[PDB]
PDB file of C-alpha atoms and ligand atoms in Angstrom:
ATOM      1  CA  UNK A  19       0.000   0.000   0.000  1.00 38.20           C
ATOM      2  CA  UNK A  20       1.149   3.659  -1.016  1.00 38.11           C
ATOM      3  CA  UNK A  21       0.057   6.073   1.930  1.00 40.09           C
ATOM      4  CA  UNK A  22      -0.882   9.352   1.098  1.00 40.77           C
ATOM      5  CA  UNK A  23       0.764  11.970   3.435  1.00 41.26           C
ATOM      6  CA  UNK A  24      -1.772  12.977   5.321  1.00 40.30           C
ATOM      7  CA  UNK A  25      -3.193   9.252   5.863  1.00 42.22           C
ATOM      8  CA  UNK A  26      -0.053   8.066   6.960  1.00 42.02           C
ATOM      9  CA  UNK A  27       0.038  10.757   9.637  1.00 40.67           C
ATOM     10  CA  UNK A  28      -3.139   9.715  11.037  1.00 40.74           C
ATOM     11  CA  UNK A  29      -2.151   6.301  11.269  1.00 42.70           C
ATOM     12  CA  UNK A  30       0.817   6.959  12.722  1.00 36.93           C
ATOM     13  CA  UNK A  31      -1.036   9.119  15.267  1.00 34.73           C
ATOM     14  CA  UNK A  32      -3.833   6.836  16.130  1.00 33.15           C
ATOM     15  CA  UNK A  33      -0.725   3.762  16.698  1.00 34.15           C
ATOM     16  CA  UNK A  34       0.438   6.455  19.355  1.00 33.27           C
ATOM     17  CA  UNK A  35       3.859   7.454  17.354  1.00 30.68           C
ATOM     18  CA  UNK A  36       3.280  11.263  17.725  1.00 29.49           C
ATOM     19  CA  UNK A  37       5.603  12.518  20.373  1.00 30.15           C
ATOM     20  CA  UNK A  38       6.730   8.987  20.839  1.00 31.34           C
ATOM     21  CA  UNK A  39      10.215   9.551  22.614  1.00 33.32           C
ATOM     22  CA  UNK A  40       9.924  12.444  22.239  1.00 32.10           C
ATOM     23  CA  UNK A  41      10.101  12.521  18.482  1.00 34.21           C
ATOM     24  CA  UNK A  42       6.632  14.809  16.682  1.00 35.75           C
ATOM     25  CA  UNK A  43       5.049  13.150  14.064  1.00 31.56           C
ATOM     26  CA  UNK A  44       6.543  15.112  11.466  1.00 29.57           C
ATOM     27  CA  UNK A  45       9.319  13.435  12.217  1.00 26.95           C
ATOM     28  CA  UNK A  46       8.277   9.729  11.543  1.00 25.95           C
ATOM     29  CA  UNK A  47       6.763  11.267   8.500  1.00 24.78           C
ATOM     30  CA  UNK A  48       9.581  12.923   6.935  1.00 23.19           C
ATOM     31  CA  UNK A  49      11.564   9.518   7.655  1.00 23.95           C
ATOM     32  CA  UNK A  50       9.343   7.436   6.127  1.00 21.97           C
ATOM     33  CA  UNK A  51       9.026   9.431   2.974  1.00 21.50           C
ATOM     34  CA  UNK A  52      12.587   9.493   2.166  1.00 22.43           C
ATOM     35  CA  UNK A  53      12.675   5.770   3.929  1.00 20.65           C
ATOM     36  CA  UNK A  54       9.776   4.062   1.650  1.00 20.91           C
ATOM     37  CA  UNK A  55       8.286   6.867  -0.321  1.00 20.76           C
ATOM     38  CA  UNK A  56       5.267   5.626   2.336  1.00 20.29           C
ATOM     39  CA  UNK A  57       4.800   2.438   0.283  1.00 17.17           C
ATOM     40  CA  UNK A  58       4.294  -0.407   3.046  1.00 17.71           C
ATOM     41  CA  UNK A  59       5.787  -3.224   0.470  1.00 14.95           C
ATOM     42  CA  UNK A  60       9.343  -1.416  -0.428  1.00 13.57           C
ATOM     43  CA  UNK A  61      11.947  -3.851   0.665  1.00 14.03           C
ATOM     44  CA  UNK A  62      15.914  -2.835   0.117  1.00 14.99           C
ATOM     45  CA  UNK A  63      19.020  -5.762   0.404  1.00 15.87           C
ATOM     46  CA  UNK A  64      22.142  -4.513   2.396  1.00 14.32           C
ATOM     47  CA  UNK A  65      25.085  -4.995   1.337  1.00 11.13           C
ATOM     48  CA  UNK A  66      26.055  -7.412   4.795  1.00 10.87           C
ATOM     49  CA  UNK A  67      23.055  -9.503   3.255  1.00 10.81           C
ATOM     50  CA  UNK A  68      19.991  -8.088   5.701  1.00 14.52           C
ATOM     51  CA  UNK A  69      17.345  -6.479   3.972  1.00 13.28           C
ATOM     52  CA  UNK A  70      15.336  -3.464   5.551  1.00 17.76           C
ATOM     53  CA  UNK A  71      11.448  -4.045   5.272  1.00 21.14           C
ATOM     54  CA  UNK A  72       8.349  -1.383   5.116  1.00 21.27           C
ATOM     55  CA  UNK A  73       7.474   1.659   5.453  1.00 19.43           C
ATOM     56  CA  UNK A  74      10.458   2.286   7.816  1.00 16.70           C
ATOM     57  CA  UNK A  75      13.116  -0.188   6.516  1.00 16.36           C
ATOM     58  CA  UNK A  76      13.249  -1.853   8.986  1.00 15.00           C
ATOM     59  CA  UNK A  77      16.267  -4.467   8.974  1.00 17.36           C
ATOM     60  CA  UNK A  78      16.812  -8.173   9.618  1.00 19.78           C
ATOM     61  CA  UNK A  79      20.006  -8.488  10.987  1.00 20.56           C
ATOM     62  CA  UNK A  80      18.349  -7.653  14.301  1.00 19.90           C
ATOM     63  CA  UNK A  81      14.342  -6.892  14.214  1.00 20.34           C
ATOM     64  CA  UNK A  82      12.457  -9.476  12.397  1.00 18.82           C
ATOM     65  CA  UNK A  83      13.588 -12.970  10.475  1.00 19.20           C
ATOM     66  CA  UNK A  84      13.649 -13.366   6.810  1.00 19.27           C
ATOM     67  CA  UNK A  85      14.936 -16.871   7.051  1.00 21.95           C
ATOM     68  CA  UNK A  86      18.020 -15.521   5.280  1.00 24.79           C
ATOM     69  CA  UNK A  87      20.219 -13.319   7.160  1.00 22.91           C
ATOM     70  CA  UNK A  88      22.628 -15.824   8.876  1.00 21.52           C
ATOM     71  CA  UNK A  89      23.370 -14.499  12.901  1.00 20.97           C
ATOM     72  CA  UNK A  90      20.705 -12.662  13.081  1.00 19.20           C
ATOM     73  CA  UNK A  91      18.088 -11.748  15.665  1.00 19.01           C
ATOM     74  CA  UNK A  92      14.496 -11.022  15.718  1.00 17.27           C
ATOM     75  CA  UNK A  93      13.600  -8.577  18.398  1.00 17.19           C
ATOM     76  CA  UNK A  94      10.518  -7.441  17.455  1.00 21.07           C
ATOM     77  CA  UNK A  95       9.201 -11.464  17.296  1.00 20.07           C
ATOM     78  CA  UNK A  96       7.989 -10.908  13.757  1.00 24.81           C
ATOM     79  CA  UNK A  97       8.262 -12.209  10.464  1.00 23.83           C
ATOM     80  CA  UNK A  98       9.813  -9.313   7.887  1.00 24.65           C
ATOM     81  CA  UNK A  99       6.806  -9.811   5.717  1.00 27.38           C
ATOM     82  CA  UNK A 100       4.664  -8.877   8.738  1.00 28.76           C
ATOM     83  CA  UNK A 101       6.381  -5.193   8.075  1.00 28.82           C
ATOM     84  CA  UNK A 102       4.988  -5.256   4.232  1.00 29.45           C
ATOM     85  CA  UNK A 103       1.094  -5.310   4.952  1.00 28.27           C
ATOM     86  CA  UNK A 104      -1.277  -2.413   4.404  1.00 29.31           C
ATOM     87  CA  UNK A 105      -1.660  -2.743   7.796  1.00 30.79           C
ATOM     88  CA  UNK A 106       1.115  -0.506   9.499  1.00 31.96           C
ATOM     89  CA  UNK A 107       0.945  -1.432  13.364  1.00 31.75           C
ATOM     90  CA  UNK A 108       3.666  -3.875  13.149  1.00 31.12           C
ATOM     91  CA  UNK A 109       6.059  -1.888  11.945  1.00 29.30           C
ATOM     92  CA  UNK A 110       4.879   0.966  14.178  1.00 28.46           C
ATOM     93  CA  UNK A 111       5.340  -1.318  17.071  1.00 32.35           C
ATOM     94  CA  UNK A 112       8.470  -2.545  16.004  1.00 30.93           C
ATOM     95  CA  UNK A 113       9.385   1.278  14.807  1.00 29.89           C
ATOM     96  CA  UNK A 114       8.555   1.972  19.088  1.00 27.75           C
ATOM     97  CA  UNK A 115      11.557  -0.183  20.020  1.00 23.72           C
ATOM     98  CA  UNK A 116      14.116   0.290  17.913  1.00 25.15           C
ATOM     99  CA  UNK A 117      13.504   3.998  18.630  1.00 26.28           C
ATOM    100  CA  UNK A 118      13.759   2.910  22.145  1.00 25.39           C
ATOM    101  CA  UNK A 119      17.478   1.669  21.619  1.00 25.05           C
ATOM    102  CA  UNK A 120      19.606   4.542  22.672  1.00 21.90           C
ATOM    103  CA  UNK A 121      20.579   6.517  19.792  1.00 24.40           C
ATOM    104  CA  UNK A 122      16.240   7.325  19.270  1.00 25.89           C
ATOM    105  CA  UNK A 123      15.674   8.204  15.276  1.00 24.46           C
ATOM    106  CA  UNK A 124      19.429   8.269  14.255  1.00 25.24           C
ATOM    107  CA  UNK A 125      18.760   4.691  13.988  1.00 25.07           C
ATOM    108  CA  UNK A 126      17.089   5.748  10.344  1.00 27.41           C
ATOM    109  CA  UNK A 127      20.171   6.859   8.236  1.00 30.53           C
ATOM    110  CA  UNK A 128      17.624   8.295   5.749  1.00 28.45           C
ATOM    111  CA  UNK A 129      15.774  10.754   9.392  1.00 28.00           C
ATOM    112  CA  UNK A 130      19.543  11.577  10.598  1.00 29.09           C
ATOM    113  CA  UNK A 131      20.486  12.982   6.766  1.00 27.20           C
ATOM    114  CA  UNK A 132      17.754  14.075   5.808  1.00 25.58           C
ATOM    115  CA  UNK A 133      15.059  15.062   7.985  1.00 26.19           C
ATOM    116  CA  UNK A 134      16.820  15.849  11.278  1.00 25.94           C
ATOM    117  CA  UNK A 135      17.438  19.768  12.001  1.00 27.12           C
ATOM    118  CA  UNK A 136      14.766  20.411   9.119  1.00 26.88           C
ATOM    119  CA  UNK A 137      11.389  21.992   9.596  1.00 25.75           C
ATOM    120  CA  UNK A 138       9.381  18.276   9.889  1.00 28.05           C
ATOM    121  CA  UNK A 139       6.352  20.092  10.593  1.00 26.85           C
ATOM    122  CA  UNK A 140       6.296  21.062   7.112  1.00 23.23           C
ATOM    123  CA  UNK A 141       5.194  16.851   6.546  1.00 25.36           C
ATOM    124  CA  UNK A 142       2.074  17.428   8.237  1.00 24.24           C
ATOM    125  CA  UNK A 143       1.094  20.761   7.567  1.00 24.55           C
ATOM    126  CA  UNK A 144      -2.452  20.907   5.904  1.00 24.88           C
ATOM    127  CA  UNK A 145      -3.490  17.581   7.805  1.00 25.77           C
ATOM    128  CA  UNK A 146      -6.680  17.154   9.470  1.00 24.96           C
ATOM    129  CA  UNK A 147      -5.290  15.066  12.821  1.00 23.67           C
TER     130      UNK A 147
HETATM  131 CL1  LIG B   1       5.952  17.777  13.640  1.00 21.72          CL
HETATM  132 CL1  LIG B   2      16.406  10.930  21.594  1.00 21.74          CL
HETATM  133 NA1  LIG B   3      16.676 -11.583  11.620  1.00 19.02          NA
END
């Protein structure tokens, strides 16, 4: 599913990601733009052999299993596919603890380079929330 802007902000809202560690939601919407384009089913190989999954690319090696990505983990107990549906509260939940990690949203390469510092209200502006 391809999320419009605006829809994905709600349903990032209602999943209880606005302000989530202390990050506004203009935030997890100007990472997953530049993440996904906000398409749920965009998957990307790395080059250690994990691929990142979903909306927020997420990535095998430690938060969900693919089958294929020898030594890794799968700390958000889900399968990667699980982070492809149209449905986007698993990879909001899993999105809550890798956020939850230490180093919050510079986990998301894409939010540190491109997003953070930036005015990330401008992702939400015109929304009804
Ligand atoms: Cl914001
Ligand atoms: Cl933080
Ligand atoms: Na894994």
């Amino acid at each position: 599913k391809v999320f419009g802007r605006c829809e994905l902000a709600a349903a990032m809202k209602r999943h209880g990601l606005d302000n989530y560690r202390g990050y506004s939601l203009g935030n997890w919407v100007c990472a997953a733009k530049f993440e996904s384009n906000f398409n749920t089913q965009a998957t990307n190989r790395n080059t250690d052999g994990s691929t990142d999954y979903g909306i927020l690319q997420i990535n095998s090696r430690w938060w969900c299993n693919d089958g294929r990505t020898p030594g890794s983990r799968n700390l958000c107990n889900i399968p990667c596919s699980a982070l492809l549906s149209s449905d986007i509260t698993a990879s909001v939940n899993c999105a809550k603890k890798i956020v939850s990690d230490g180093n919050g949203m510079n986990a998301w390469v894409a939010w540190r380079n491109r997003c953070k510092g930036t005015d990330v209200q401008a992702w939400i502006r015109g929304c009804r929330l």
